């Protein structure tokens, strides 16, 4: 049996910070359910690029559990993330049942819009880093992957490979994560 | 006035490989055309991202010149691309005129088939060595990106933010380069 990720992609995300996760869980043969927050038309990312949905978030949350919840970033998408009802929801029931969340860039500060996850150790992108600690509600980290408990976060499109490695090895163990991360080509 | 580039999406595409260069070169104020080689329709990527063409091949080519073409690698996008006469002549034309040329992984096999650049110091994915080297056309490097005159090859997922920092650079200059680098938390 396989684990399954649903990636929530809404209009400004940032598209490297989409697109390294889907790829890499997806090499790790992790199903992967590239959500659109709108509905399922093409959705513009940060960056202009068009990424077509696999289905809309409405459709893909009848179809859980998901074993991980991925939040890119982009601070308008991530935005977008953070006035989402639907998102509220998928979140708490996804703490409620002790899955993981992961979220890279602006992503995390939809966990603070949501109150998912209060008190863990947490990094944003440093641009993020007022937004996420408004409140303190989190203690703040600059390491490039943070993982505290089910609440994995990272920094920007340049620690994406790490990010994506971090949830492969959450769900699928280390030798898996070390096996899809040799053909990357990383440093 | 701004540089272009134009890069050209096939079937089977790298996806981290297509949106790391557009995305970095967009951040970089170039303007990117996303050419999709078969037309304007989507184009699934080798992990099933779907991407949306900014226009057709057809179209894009009439549009130029353009101060870089980009091909991605994906071992079956890097096949179509080689396989294409159109590829061919854009490339010829590039060449020619001077123009860069920038292929990443399995892209720059490519080159190879099209003829293109023979001579040049070269790199590729490492599992795509033996097919570059097919007749010892080019001489093979194992650094991260090479650069020899107007034809620049990289190596895998995980080398295309040096990839695309060097399209910067060769375009617009290193202080551009070291701009847009800053704000993508690369090591």
Redo the contacts between chains.
């Keep these: 049996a396989s684990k399954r990720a649903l990636v929530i992609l809404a209009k400004g995300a940032?598209?490297?910070e989409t697109?390294?996760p889907?790829?890499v869980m997806?090499?790790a043969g992790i199903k992967v359910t590239?959500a659109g927050l709108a509905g399922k038309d093409?959705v513009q990312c940060?960056?202009?690029?068009?990424?077509?949905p696999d289905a809309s978030l409405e459709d893909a949350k009848k179809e859980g559990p998901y074993d991980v919840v991925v939040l890119p970033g982009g601070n308008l998408g991530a935005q977008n993330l953070s006035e989402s009802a639907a998102v509220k929801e998928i979140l708490k029931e996804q703490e409620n049942r002790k899955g993981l969340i992961a979220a890279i860039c602006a992503g995390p500060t939809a966990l603070l819009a949501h109150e998912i996850g209060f008190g863990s150790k947490v990094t944003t992108?440093?641009?993020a880093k007022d937004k996420m600690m408004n409140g303190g509600h989190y203690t703040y980290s600059e390491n490039?992957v943070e993982k505290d408990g089910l609440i994995l976060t990272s920094?920007?499109?340049?620690?994406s490979?790490e990010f994506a490695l971090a949830i492969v090895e959450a769900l699928n163990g280390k030798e898996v994560a070390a096996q899809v991360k040799a053909?990357?080509?990383?440093?």
Tied chains: 1, 2.
């Design positions: 940032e598209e490297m697109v390294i889907v790829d997806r090499r590239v093409p940060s960056r202009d690029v068009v990424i077509c992108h440093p641009l490039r920094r920007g499109p340049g620690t490979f053909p990357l080509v990383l440093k």
